[model samples]
Every structure is written in structure tokens, then in C-alpha cells.
Target: SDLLVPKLTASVTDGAVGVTVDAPVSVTAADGVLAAVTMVNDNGRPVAGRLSPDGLRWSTTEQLGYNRRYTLNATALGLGGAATRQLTFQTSSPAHLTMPYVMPGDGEVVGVGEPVAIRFDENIADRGAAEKAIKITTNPPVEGAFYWLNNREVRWRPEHFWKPGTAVDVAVNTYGVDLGEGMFGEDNVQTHFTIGDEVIATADDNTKILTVRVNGEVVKSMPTSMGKDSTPTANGIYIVGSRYKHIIMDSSTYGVPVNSPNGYRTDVDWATQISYSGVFVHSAPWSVGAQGHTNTSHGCLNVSPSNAQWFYDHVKRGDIVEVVNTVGGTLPGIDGLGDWNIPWDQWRAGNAK
Candidate 1:
């Protein structure tokens, strides 16, 4: 009679090389029962795995690391007794993975109006997969949604401005995730940010006034000049992006030439940029007389030197600035920090997931 014997098969061939990091490692027994199975790293640290109830197969339970050596050992028993098999393999070194960048920065303290922004180096064809890899946790737990600004940019914002003094945590677990079109996430990233005080400013072109508030209390109400009808100021919500004590205002930065009839370049003090289209709340000594009485600016908010200094000192990045009743239509959401202009429902609906 022929002697009965057990046979074992491993998903990873003995001495296999260049196996994918995420590939499943499994082993099976034929004509026998599996007595035991074990997997470990080169240091002898056991790698977590699971065996079938029938003791006929086993597989790894967690993802393997790249370019790391792993050993898998298995034993089987039959009428002829127990036999052992071993295999060693190394995961492939990733050559086509890219990492993404996160905004608001680690340990940053931003105003309540700022949103959490992420930009991938590559255009993500699989938005759902990419979005799912992101995890956000807040100390107070605010309701928010992620909106795809484009193929490479995604932003998250609370339904309302982030509550003052809230802490936010972001984790991007994209390592080894297939981002489609043969692209993979290179690594994981995390960040923590805090929401600072609530600073809000409301500008009314028709009334020629700008009311500033901090934490819901009226702080400063100053006379102002908005854009003239020909160059109407944008009307909508904006976020204070940056500030400068003194900066040159260049008309050529836009389409207008410095020597043009409607263009002039000059150094201004206490300039606070409120839009990406060169709209600022800055000291305009030339328009002081017309500031509170009539609109005279090209498309900016003109204030007296003293008032501009006060506003500049109080303003912070991510603070809200709402311009209203201007001949210019609502500000485009794509403009600098114009996100608040998007309705809550519309913002939520833009989620790719």
C-alpha cells in the first residue's frame, strides 16, 4: 500500500522576491490537517494572521510593510505524522507612490472661518476612495462636510464657522491606497489645529460703512469707500488672508497698467487683503473725503489712515469679511476664501463620497 502523506501550499513561494506590500499571504493543506501556522518579521516578532476553523488554511490579518523580510511557517499532520514547511519573502519597494499635502499646517491656530484644505500632488480620479481615507476628529465634534474644489484639491468646513476655541485633528491614512490610474498614496500624514477668536467684519457699499465685531460684540464702525460703479467691488463673504503695515499697490498686478488712465501705483499703510483680486481694506488718504460720502476706489475698501491702522491691528487671518450691496455680483466661491458664499446644502452636495 502507498504511504499516506500531507502536502502544504503557500501563497508566497519559497524565497519569493518583490511581492507587493499589500498582497495577501496565505497557506493551505491538502490531504491533511494543519497542525500550526505562524508568520513573523525578520526580528522574530509575530505578524498577526488567522487560521481556518477546519485547520486547512491560514492568512495574514494585516497589511505587510514594504521592502521588509517576512517568514511564514506551517505544519501539517497526516497518518504519516507531522511535517513542517517554511518560506521567506520580501515585499516590493514602492516605486510609483506619491504623498499629499495638508493645509492649515500642523499646530496652527487659525480663525474660525478657515477651512481644512488638502491638496494631492496628482489629480485623483477616485475622489471617493481618497476622501474615505481622511479622518477628522474635533474636540467638540462639529458637523462638517468635504467638498472637492477640483481634481487635486478637497476642502472641509463646518456647517457654520468653527466654534471658538475648538481643536481639530486630521489623519490621512492613504499609504498604499490605490488612487486609481496606477497611482498609490506614498505615506500617511496627520495634523492638529485650533480655532481662535471670532472676528467678523461687515462692509456695506450703499451705506459707505464697515462694521467690525469681535466675538459678536461691536468693536469698530468706520467710514469706508467701496468700488465705483464702473469697477464695482465684489459683494459676498471673504476671509482676511494676510496683512501688511505698508505695501505697494500695483495696478499692473491686475490687467490695468500703472500709467493707464484708471491705474495708479502707490505705497499704502495698514493694508489688509480681503480678496485675491487685489481688493483690500487699506489706508487711502487720497479718498478720505469721498470714503464716507461716495464710492471712489477702483474696487477696494478705502479707509482713513487711522481707521485702517486700527482695523489692521485687529484683523487676523481667517476672520470673516462680508461685502454687501455692491454693483458687483456675489463673489465667486473660487476666489480667496469665498467658501462661505456657498450655501450649506450646496457645499454638502459637492462631496464626492
Candidate 2:
């Protein structure tokens, strides 16, 4: 006779259950072992069942409810008797959830000039569904609007900085909402962040550099390279438009001569703070002295790696990155290209509603 040791394990995620079973039973035994499995439901309901794979394995395909607990039990039979095991577990119940729309995370504090940005992992099929789910309530009721950056990201920025001492609440009711196709939405979440002091923007097109300041203090500065004689850097009032941690500065894609005097064909490493289209405040250790003195390279603000890192660390999203006084030229709202010359009103008009 062989001794049997019963072993079982289970886990759940996103309403799905996974189980692993390992029980020793002798096939040579005269009588076959009987296996039973069960779950303890709400209202103390005892749901009993038999093991699948003819007592060799057991599984459930049912989708569990979020923030709910489930209890499991297993019983097995040996040559002359029966054995039993049991366990219990719970699922995650997010405090805030959205179905057709993504909610602005609550309890987050940003700069006074910062904008409300919401990024979603899924595509929104219905704009109205998302608009309805998004509800913002401020203690003083600051004026704001939601602008769709794309199908997956939305932002809300006031005409100016929020009041220094205002309480804000952002809520999203996404449960049971249709996101499009056959997908439905989920639970609710809330985050709250406060605003700090104001930040200033300084753009020097002659040197091709942008400086960001806080409370009249120079917190960070980056050296940028403006466009060549043919392609010029845009000159105007610009805000920090986007951000990227590590980006490849490929020259071939920009249609610059690989080995020519004006063309820089090398791919440089950059941790960019995009202010105007292709113009970013990035690292260019190779162009050290040329940062604040010359506008020689392409239309990017080039700074040393150390300076770039310093700038990236102190600045927050929505901080201004103004670029001024460039000789080349400013293109009219050229999408995906660095053109800071366009006014704010014109920039807002380019949004996809």
C-alpha cells in the first residue's frame, strides 16, 4: 500500500480562477478513489460538485465578482477511506473604476500651472460615454474643460493655474457602461493632488535654450539646437507639450544628409521634454558649449546629460517651455513638428474634440 499526500493551490485575477491539483492515489487499489469539489457562495449557500478529468483534476470557468471572497473544498478517497482539504481567498475591489471612460486619478498634487491629464490603456468608442462618466467638483468650482488628446488620452486644463487653495474632486462612474464592441466597464477610483507655486518659462532662440523657473527661481535649464539655415526653429510662446524617457533621434527619418555638413546622421540617446513639436529639451553631451551660445544643430534644445537630467527631475508636466527669437522660421501648426510660434488658441483648435 502506498501512502497518499493531498496537495492543492488556487489563485484569482480579473475575475478568473486558476487551480493546481496534486494528489497521490494508487491505481492498483481495489476500489477507485472518489473526489469532490465545492465552493462556499454568498448567503452561506453550499455549492458541492465532483472533480473534472474523472477525479484526476478539477477547475471552474465561472467569472468571479470583484471584491468578493470564495471558499473552496476538495475531498478524495483512498483504498479504504476518504480525505479532505479546504481554502479561502478574495479578489481585488478597486475603489474607483471606469468602463467606457478613464478616470483622472485622485489625490495627486501638481504645479499651479499644471494641466489635468488622463491616460487610458484602452480605446474609447463613445466620447459621450466618457464625458458622462467624468465628473469634476471643486470646492470653489474652478472653470475647466476636457480636451481629447487622442482616443486613449484626455486632458483637462483651466484657462490658467487653479487657485492656490482650492479643493478638487474628480469622479468616474464606469460600471456597466459599454466601451464598444462587447466590452463593458468596471469600478471606481479617486485620487487627490494639491497645487504648489507658479513656474516661469524662458526661451532664448539665439542660444536655442529653454529655462523653466519656479517662484522666480531657476530650477532647471536645457541647451537646445535650433534648425539649420534651411530648416529654422519656431519662435514663440510654447508650453511643455509632451514627454518621453528614452527616444532615438534618428536623422534619416528627418530627411537630413547623412555625411553632409548641415546633416547630422547619427542616432543620439535622449530623455526628452517636448515643448514644441520636434523641438525637445534633451541630452546632447556632444554639443557642450554650443548649448547657450550657438544655434547650429537641428531644431532641438540640446543640453549635457547632467543638465538634462537635472531639468527632467525638477519639472512637472504642464510646465511652460517657451522658445523665443529664432531666425529660421515658424511653421503654422505643423503637426508632429516643433513649431512653438502657433498661439494657444490655435493649438486648442487642433484638438480632436
Candidate 3:
């Protein structure tokens, strides 16, 4: 007489051990129909899988975690009766795994020009795999691309400056992902951040004027003095770095001797740094007479005390500052936030994928 129960077989033997993380786990029934299938981890968490259209086979749809133990329970029905089959297995441990560090931080509120930066502890040979693991979602939806500054450093930015008040979420799902050369991701990372107000400053050395805009609205247009001919200011896009209520401006910091004929140290108020190379937009009351009329400061944008204080109070880290009509030439990409200086095509070309 024929048996009452259907015969079931699993790709992984019962109580199997040392299964590769990426190995396929599936079940097949003979002379029977699959009634149900369930896979769960040691912690009782359900593992997602997909069943074949004919319901005769079932397999995992997601990558299994390394060094994890899982249990598979399935039921099948035959002409005579229903029977259950179970299997327990463990995934092989990775030889080496690395995690990536995400910047802009969790729950941080950053400026409009701040790009999402990520760094991996180990070099990733498979750029496509690494890129696929990264996911970014924006509230209003943004079109952006990832650029590999190097093998270990990758950054992402919107086509233009982020819209003010934009909310962004980042997910780096690298765990168990193959990064080539036998390297895998150790863990996953996530971050949520928001974009603050939009602040852009334009300084024209030829006109000796500085125009400030808030959210594209002109708020302040003040007469300003830039670096003199000998110490011309760099012209290009810059991101605000730091602010100092009152600090001594020393020429020696930038290689100029304090005792030199053209070098002198002076106390300045409301100093805001725009570049890493000793360039600041600060108050220079001593140069007020020449402000708006000509350039006289030492590579700094000099303004009156009142105007400087007003700008200082309004400015924040990541604000964009554009300098023009300066003999010093455009800012170099090596400077802070100089990524904005790169053309869109060139930027996209930097992607390893």
C-alpha cells in the first residue's frame, strides 16, 4: 500500500552545519503539495523567503547573516495525509568583515552644501557592491549620485545645494554583503538629518562690496574690503567653518612673519572662517576708511563692526560663500567644500561604478 504521507527533502540536511552565508536553502516535496513553510532565526525572528509559483519549492530571498543559526520548518500534504519536515543549520563565519563610518552624524542638522561622506576601514575592491549597499532617501525626493573620492572614501551630494529644510535618511546595509577579495560587511549603519537655513554670501573684490542672501532673499549689501593686491583673496565657492566672537588675527599663521614689513598682528571681532587657508570674513575697523572704496585687508573680507556682528550671528557651519573679481583666482578643490567647484560631469565620472 502507498504511504499516507508525502516525502520531503531539504537542500540542507537535518542538523546541518557550516553552510555558506550565500548558499541557497530550499525544500522540495515528492508526490505531495507544500502546505506551509517557515524559517526563523535562533532569536525567533522570521526570515523572509519566497515560494515558487507552483508551491512545490521555497527558498530564502534575503542574504543570511554570517555565523547565524536558523531553523526551517515545513509542512506538506499528500493523497493520504499531511506531514512536517524540519532542518537546523548554521552559516559559515566570515574571515574578515568591515563596517563603514557615515558622516553628517545621526540626527544632525547641517548646512545646505554639506555632502554625505562615508569611509570604510578596509579598501573595497568591488565598487558596485559597495555602492549598492548604500541607500539614501529624501523627503521631497532628490536626484543625486555617489562619487568615490578614493577606494575607501565615498561621498554623495545633490545636483545642487540641498533645499532648505530638507529631511534626509541614510542606510548603509553592508552586513553580509560581498565586497570582493573575501571581504564582507560586519554591520549596518543608519542616519537621519535635516538641512537648515540657506545662507549664501557673495563678495566682489572689484566692486568692494559684499552681498548676503538668506533663502535667496537679499538681506544685507554692505561695503566691504577684501585682500589687497599683494595678498589677494581666493575667489570661488567656500563653506563656512568656524566663528570667533573676538580673536587675534596673526599673520604668522599663514607663513607671514609678525615682524615683517607687510605682516602685523591685530585683534579682530566677529571673525568667521570661510576657508582653511587663513581666509576669514571678519571685522576690521582699522580698514573701515578703505572699506567699499578699495581692498586693504590681508586676504580677509573686512567690514564694519556692526555689519560683521550681523553676519557673524546669522552665519552657521556649511554656509556657502562665493568670492569673485579677485586676482587671487578661483578656489582650489582641495579647500573646504570645494566639491562644489567640480563640474557635474566630472563629479559623476568619479564614481567607481
Candidate 4:
């Protein structure tokens, strides 16, 4: 009498190593129908699975953990007999996940031009895969697109600016997912923010004045001096970035030694950053004589101490500022809030990996 037994096969070979934690686990019976199937993690907890109606196949229905062992067992009955097969595999335990940060941070209030930017500690090789894992939800539902400013930063902005009082939420759920470089995104991050009243400041080089308005009413108008022709300020939109009540302006920081003819080191007050490339609208009492009549700054907006303090007091991060009537030069989209300067189609079309 021939003792025929059922033949069963597993998705992975027994004793497999470095398997993906989310890998599919399945079993199939060829000679006959499957009688039963079971899976268990090293913790002794049973893994959930589903069996086909025909009993010829079974599959795991849940995810696994890292650096863990799992056992998959199945039984099938043939015309002559029944047999059981067991398979074991190990999941990969990579170093750590690349964490990400979202801005404007949680509980923040920003200007209408504020774009939701995300930064990663690790260099991302696959940007598209990473973007899909980041989600944005807004009250009243605003439309937007994600644009990569660099390998480490990706920003999302709408076709136009955000509406006043708009609420936004960002969710980054890339844990256990690959984003590029060997990156299994680390801890998931989430943030929420709202838009405040619209504030805009206009810097007219032709008139050497800074006019500030909130909503639509002009509030503060100050005489000012801007970057001289040798280092003329780029004509475009800028956002208020970092601010300091007092700082030592060091020419050496920008590579011009203090002893150099065009170099200077001075104690400044009420300095507000408009660009990462070293442009600021700050108090410059030394240039007070030249303000309102001549542009003699090194690309910074040189305003009186009182005027600088007033502007600094009212504006927060992400407020809008514009430079008008200047020589042809551009602020790259990655510089501060130069985001608004890029045309809608160009900005959208530039959202490439």
C-alpha cells in the first residue's frame, strides 16, 4: 500500500534570515487541501492569519516586529494521509529610523505665506516614496503640493497663500517604511498650526522707506537704507525668520575680515533675518545719515533703532516682506520665505525628486 502524504510549501524557506518585518507569510498545499494553519511570534503571541475557502492556502493578516523570530506551521490532508510542516524566519533589526521634524511647529501661528516644511536628519535618496508617507489636512480643505528644496528638506505650499484663520495639520507616518538611503523612518511626527491676520511690509528702494500694514491698514512707515549697488538686495518677497534683540554683527562671519575696507563688526539691536544668505533688516545707527536718501548697506535694510525695534516687536516668524525698485537679482526659493516669489506653475512643476 502506498502511503501518499500531502505536500505543503511556505512563502519563505525555513531558517530564512533578514526578512522584512512586513513580509507576507503564506502556505499552500499542492497534493491536497490545507487542514489548519498557525503562526506565532517569539513572545508566544499567535499571529492572526486567514485561510482560503478551498483550504488550499493560508496567509498572515498582521505585521511583525523587528529583529524577531516567527514560526509558521500548516497541516494538509491528502487522499492517503495528513502531514504538518513548520517554517521559521527572522526579521531585520536595522540600526534606527531617520527622524523627521515639521514646521511651523505645533501650536504656532504664522503668516499666510507660511509653507509647511519638513526636515529630516538623514539624507533621503527616495523623495517620492517619502512624500507619499507625509499627509496634510486643513480645515476647509486647502489644496497644495510638496516641493523638495533639498535632500533634507521638503516644503508644501498652496497655489496661493494660506487663508487667514486657516488651520493645518501634518502627519508623518513613515515608521517601518523605507524612504531611501537605508532609511526606515523613525518615530512618527505630527504638528498643527493656524494662520493669523495678514501682515505685509513693503521696502521701496526708490523711496528708501519701509511701510508696514496689518490686514490692510498702514501702521508703520520708516525711513530706511538698503544694500548698496555693490551688494544690492535682491528684489523679491522675504519672510521674517530668526530674530534677536541684540547681536554682534560680525563681518568675519560672512568671510570679510573686520580690518577689510568693506568689512565691519558692530553691536546691533532688533535684528530680524530675511534670508539665510545673511540679509537682515536691523538697526544700523551708523547709516542713519544715509537712510531715506541713499542705499549704502551691504544688502541689509538699515533702519533707525526705534524703527527696527517697532518692526521686530510686531512681526513673528513667517511674516511677509517685499523689496521693490531694485537691481535685477533673485532670492532662491530655498532662502527664507522666497517661496512666494516662484510662479505657481513653476513652483508646482519644480516639485521633483
Put down candidate 2 lDDT per residue, 233-295, tens digits, no spaces. Answer: 666544454455567655555576566665554444445545434567767877787777776
Residue 86, candidate 1: alpha-carbon lDDT: 85
Q: What is the lDDT of residue 146 in candidate 2?
A: 61
Best by TM-score: 4
Model 4 spans with C-alpha error above 4 angstroms: 1-65, 70-89, 92-97, 251-262
Predicted candidate 1 versus true structure: per-residue lDDT over 94-133, tens digit per residue: 5466688987889988888988888898888788888888
lDDT of 2 at 174: 52
Q: What are the lDDT figures for the candidates, one per model?
A: 0.86, 0.55, 0.84, 0.85
Winner on lDDT (2 vs 4): 4
Per-residue C-alpha lDDT of model 3 across residues 214-254, encoded as one tens digit per residue: 88999998789998889888788887777899999888987
Task: Give the lDDT of residue 173 in candidate 1.
Answer: 81
Name the runs in model 3 displaced over 4 angstroms: 1-98, 106-111, 121-124, 180-183, 222-231, 241-273, 276-278, 282-306, 334-336
| Clash statistics: count for each candidate | 0, 25, 0, 1
Q: Order the candidates by lDDT, highest first.
A: 1, 4, 3, 2
| lDDT score for residue 202 of model 4 | 94
**Which residue runs does candidate 2 get wrong by more than 4 Å?**
1-107, 164-167, 179-183, 207-209, 217-224, 229-232, 235-272, 275-278, 327-353
Candidate 4's TM-score: 0.77
Runs in model 1 lying further than 4 Å from the true structure: 1-98, 250-265, 351-353
